[PDB]
Amino acid sequence: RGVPHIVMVDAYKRY
Amino acid sequence: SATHIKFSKRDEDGRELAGATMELRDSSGKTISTWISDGHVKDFYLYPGKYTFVETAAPDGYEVATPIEFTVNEDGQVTV
């Protein structure tokens, strides 16, 4: 419990 | 001592995303780890310092994300 979650989002290319 | 953190590489729909080429660097430019995201959260244990998650390449069809800097404090608090 309490472990930090670091999130990196990869967005879609328009295609 | 070392602090447990989790890193998640996700898509725009909140789902873990496999195939991204990633690295974790410290404030002096040393590479702590390189890996390919596998569609699950990735755990790390890190000593106090300033670090950066850097995406070298995204899977086909995705855009590379901006690097994420964070600090592991002397007391185990992590700040993003």
Author numbering:
A (entry chain B): 108 to 122
B (entry chain A): 23 to 102
Structure paper excerpt:
The SpyCatcher system derives from the collagen adhesion domain of Streptococcus pyogenes, in which an internal irreversible isopeptide bond spontaneously forms between the side chains of a lysine and an aspartate residue. In 2012, the Howarth group split the protein into the so-called SpyCatcher001 domain, containing the lysine residue, and the SpyTag001 peptide, containing the aspartate. They showed that, when the two are mixed in solution, the covalent isopeptide bond spontaneously forms on a timescale of minutes at micromolar concentration, recapitulating the original protein. The group later used a phage display platform and selective mutation targeted towards enhancing electrostatic complementarity to develop the SpyCatcher002 and SpyCatcher003 variants, each with higher affinity and speed of isopeptide bond formation.
We first crystallized and solved the structure of the SpyCatcher003–SpyTag003, which had not previously been solved. In all structures, the isopeptide bond distance between the nitro­gen atom of Lys31 and the gamma carbon atom of Asp117 is within 1.4 Å. Compared with the SpyTag001 constructs, the SpyTag003 version contains three additional residues at the N-terminus which are visible in the density. To compensate for the additional positive charge in SpyTag003, the mutations K37R, Q62H, A89P, T91E and Q97D were introduced into SpyCatcher003. A89P was also engineered to reduce flexibility in the 79–89 loop which lines one side of the SpyTag docking region.
